[PDB]
Amino acid sequence: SLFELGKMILQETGKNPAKSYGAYGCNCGVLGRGKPKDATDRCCYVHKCCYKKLTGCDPKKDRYSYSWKDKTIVCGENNPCLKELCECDKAVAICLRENLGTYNKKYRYHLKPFCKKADPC
Amino acid sequence: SLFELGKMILQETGKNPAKSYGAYGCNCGVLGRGKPKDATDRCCYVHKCCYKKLTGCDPKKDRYSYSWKDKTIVCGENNPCLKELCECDKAVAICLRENLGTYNKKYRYHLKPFCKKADPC
Secondary structure: HHHHHHHHHHHHOOHHHHHHHHHEEOOOOOEEEEEEEEHHHHHHHHHHHHHHHHOOOOOOOOOOEEEEHHHOOEOOOOOHHHHHHHHHHHHHHHHHOOOHHHOOOOEEOOOOOOOOOOOOO | OHHHHHHHHHHHHHOHHHHHHOOOOOOOOOOOOOOOOOHHHHHHHHHHHHHHHOOOOOOOOOOOOOEEEEEEEEEEEHHHHHHHHHHHHHHHHHHHHHOHHOOOOOOOEOOOHHHHOOOOO
């Protein structure tokens, strides 16, 4: 759920999840997908596609387990969906961190500035 | 949509919606989660709950008609969902204004990850 994801983003990026990625580009946020603005945006794009493939579990509300031992996200055993959900979030937190170098605050928004269509995931 | 909500909030509270509530506490803004920290956060909590009852429309993108008539938000879309959606927004806007007395800027960009679980709606 948003609790795991959010905590992961914070752990990987050190940034406030909602503040830097709640509304960022075309894919970081609660507004669906769009043509990636930049490497941070592309991370969220893939994240949303990662969710799409999921089957059965609610990526927004299903709470799952994961360890933060040695400051690396270790997805808990869980079940297939939950494990896959966790990996989706882990993956985006990491990607987000790895792309902090090009993170551009200018892509942060109040209301998504209209975005180009996003490749069918 | 966020446009109507943002204007309602500005109109009601007289403060920039995004800055003051875009990321306030545990329930305000980009999908805020968990138990409200205070009255203002509670408003957003109630708001997110109100949103759950919406059948047929999307608070994110669905625009709706409402008027500001004698400094009162007056919902206009006779379309049932949109009207209800509009009433959700109106209500949170009024609630925020009403609890401006305890608005805590230290929560303005609260670290949502710090948020505890929230009761069901």
